[PDB]
Design a protein around this nucleic acid. Structure first.
Lengths: 182, 116
RNA sequence: CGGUAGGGGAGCGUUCCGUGUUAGGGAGAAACGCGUGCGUGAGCCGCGUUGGACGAAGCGGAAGCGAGAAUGUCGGCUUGA
RNA sequence: GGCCAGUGAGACGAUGGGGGAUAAGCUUCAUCGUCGAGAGGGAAACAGCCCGGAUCACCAGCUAAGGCCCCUAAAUGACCG
RNA sequence: AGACAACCUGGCGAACUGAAACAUCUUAGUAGCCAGAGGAAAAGAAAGCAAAAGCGAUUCCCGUAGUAGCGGCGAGCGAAAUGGGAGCAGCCUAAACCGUGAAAACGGGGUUGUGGGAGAGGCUGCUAGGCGAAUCAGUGGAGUGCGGAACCCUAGAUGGUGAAAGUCCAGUAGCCGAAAGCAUCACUCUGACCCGAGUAGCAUGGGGCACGUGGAAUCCCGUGUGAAUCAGCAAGGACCACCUUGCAAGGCUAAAUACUCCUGGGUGACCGAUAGCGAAGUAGUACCGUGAGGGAAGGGUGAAAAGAACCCCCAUCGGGGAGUGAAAUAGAACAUGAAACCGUAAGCUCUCAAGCAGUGGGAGGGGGACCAGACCCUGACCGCGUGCCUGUUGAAGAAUGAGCCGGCGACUCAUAGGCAGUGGCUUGGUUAAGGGAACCCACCGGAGCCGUAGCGA
RNA sequence: UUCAAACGAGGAAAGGCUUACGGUGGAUACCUAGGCACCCAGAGACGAGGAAGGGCGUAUUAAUCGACGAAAUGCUUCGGG
């Protein structure tokens, strides 16, 4: 049996055939069309406000508003693009040549796209590494340092932040560190 | 894709009219009034088919009663039915009444040998 | 296995498109009016008259898709006479 | 617990009460019946009382409530008041 | 100079509405009026973005994102940079200096940002056209259709022709062609002096930037004040310091973008005379209105007028024979010709009846050119039976609605959010714009989006 | 057969129902003589050498519609057929 424009059809259940509504009382939803009997919801046009409690004070206006979001304070939008040690092990390589934003993006389950794309890595010990690799990243967790130094991975923090400071601030900090020296 | 109705209306209203084409006056020839009346005709038919079953029985009982009272001076339908079941005899009212018409000899014969 | 509001399931038709410039058709199509066929029904199916050229299925698709009510609306024709 | 409705005018009857004039087919609550949304039979006719819950066919049968002089199915039945 | 469908620039500028009322706010700088101009218009060559990493004039699409925000923090309103595309292009001018008094009014010298200056030392297309392959008969009005036998094709796009044609016609694929006109290619610095002045800024009153005056920046304005000149000025969301970026108060500039009174070419799960433009007929007509203004309806004899010589009724109209024609049960009121409504003919049947007109039972009578206990029409007389809809606690209702008959006449579409069914992928999935001998469409485009870590302001 | 009683058929209507055939009317069907929407190119004109739009004309013979303008159903020139 060969496929032609004669033979084809859909599978049972895919295309439902909807409700042309108000075409006889046998078809069911007819003459008033499943809206009962007069009143605000029967009429044509927009319904109400959504969340409207009827003139009773709505929930969305009788509860206080979530501490930080009540005038300023941008919500804690995440930094660092967290991977874990548990998530790395599935993407295997013997001398794991710099597990970084490059290699993981090439394959390892990490698709930064939007504002994510400007972020560094934080590596976070969810658990274990059977193999010895070389890692290249920003900042590691408390467990991650322990597990990496236990595994024996050539771990290297690489910064690239460089804050401008101001000559006066540097003078002050040079005074500080100078004093700490003596 | 404009869709004129045309064909689909009066091809059913002909069938609606086919029912009512023995009716008397306005009812036979006026679309919406025919549609109003056909329904009622069918309802009275359905209703009267069940009236039929009890009414025929009620006629038959009267026939049998009329037949049986011509025997003895004090003998009567009520007694007759219990005398049938006393002797174990499953003749239904239809048969009894119709033989009472078409062959009264046979009712005489049934009456004679039920008493004993 | 009564059933209003009301919810859920299963269908019938309408015009148009794919299949299809298909077969069927000036030895008569669409229509229109009649059937002592069929179906639970919406509807289906054969008929020879009127009619004078369009156009079934089946498998699929899409809607200006189904009317008796709106002091609806357009046209026709009554009643009062 | 998910998706997605209608409802938010109720009515009468029994009981427990309030208001009223222990008037109202009055009104307001509490518990239950029926109507509402329930055909059929009894009640002359008679939503709300009594019987009983209609899937469909039979020109079969038994019964509930209620009845058996005639209109109009069944005893012008019985015995005692 | 006036006219000009929309699009566009500038001036003035509503209200209904939403906020379940309403004044802030929203409707909206929308509708309207007014002025102006082009094929587009406006914008536009940084006193700009951005963050210590960089970008390089505008304008338009995807996106970021319904995020950051604003908001009687209510209704609502709502960005941009980074990123992907479409399309790219950059110019000129004034003074400091020079000459012909001198800001009498003319030429030269230069105009730039991680500082720059001058000074002194015929080609093709369009507007007409042209040539252009291949079929014949049987078929009872007519053949392109049917069965038969052929042929062409770089032509099987279309419209016609007595009936639907690749080969009958006009054409088409394919090639050919312009006198004339339109479009297209054709080393130093005195750090002298220069850096757009009633300007910027400032006070005060406003407008507008998503941003309601708010901590309110940036941009523009009435009133009053009133700077500086690259050892400068302005911006980097009050403000000061330090960095970085730029050069305001003079101008010009193609593209990508918006639209349809309109022309040519193509296409349609568009309409087919109550539809489609209001308008298929000499329609913005007839008609109404003082006037602005409103505003209809009315298509289909046949292939061919062959549209009926002649005769009869007869003043006409019209009619019947005749004749034409496939058909005149196509005769101009002409094609198919439903219903209501109006009749004519036949079968049965009502004048002691009472009835939402039916229904169950069925007396007597009638059939259909087809021999049936079958079927149909009528229906003596009996029993039952409170029109439909809406909408009600409850409606036969003397509550509402419809004179009847036929048409038209109502949960749609676009975009998003949730959920279900189905399918694809699960090496996670998916692409948006945008590109495609257009539209679909192979095949590209990974920019973004969703999932892979929560907790806390 | 005389007359007493009963019973009342068969004939007999305007109309009703059924079938047929007409008329009225213009639904449905098939249709086009006009519209509608997109896509690809263009174009967005014209006017003081008088416009957009109109009044009045212009043929051998009445009306209108288009064409045309006292050079008035047209005139000149260069091309095509």
């Amino acid at each position: 049996t060969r496929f032609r424009l004669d033979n084809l059809g859909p599978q049972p259940g895919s295309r439902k055939k909807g409700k042309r509504k108000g075409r006889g009382h046998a078809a069911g939803q007819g003459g008033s069309c499943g809206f009962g009997m007069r009143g605000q919801k029967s009429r044509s046009g927009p319904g109400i406000m959504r969340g409207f409690e009827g003139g009773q004070m709505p929930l969305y206006r009788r509860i206080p508003k979530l501490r930080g979001i009540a005038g300023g304070m941008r919500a804690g939008l995440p930094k660092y693009v967290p991977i874990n040690l548990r998530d790395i092990e599935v993407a295997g390589f013997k001398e794991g040549e710099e597990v970084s934003l490059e290699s993981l993006k090439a394959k390892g389950i990490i698709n930064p796209s939007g504002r994510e794309r400007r972020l560094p890595l934080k590596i976070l010990g969810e658990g274990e590494l059977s193999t010895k690799l070389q890692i290249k990243a920003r900042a590691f967790s408390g467990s991650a340092k322990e597990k990496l130094e236990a595994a024996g991975c050539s771990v290297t923090v690489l910064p690239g932040r460089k804050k401008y400071i101001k000559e006066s601030v540097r003078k002050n900090l040079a005074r500080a560190d100078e004093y700490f020296a003596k | 894709t404009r869709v004129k109705r045309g064909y689909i209306a009066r091809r059913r209203r002909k069938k609606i009219r086919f029912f009512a084409s023995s009716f008397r006056g306005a009812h036979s020839r006026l679309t919406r009034t025919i549609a109003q009346q056909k329904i009622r005709a069918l309802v009275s038919a359905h209703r009267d088919r069940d009236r039929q079953k009890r009414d025929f029985r009620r006629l038959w009982i009267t026939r049998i009663n009329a037949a049986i009272r011509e025997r003895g001076v004090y003998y009567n339908y009520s007694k007759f039915i219990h005398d049938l079941y006393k002797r174990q005899l499953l003749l239904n009212r239809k048969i009894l009444a119709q033989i009472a018409i078409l062959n009264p000899n046979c009712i005489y014969m049934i009456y004679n040998e039920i008493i004993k």
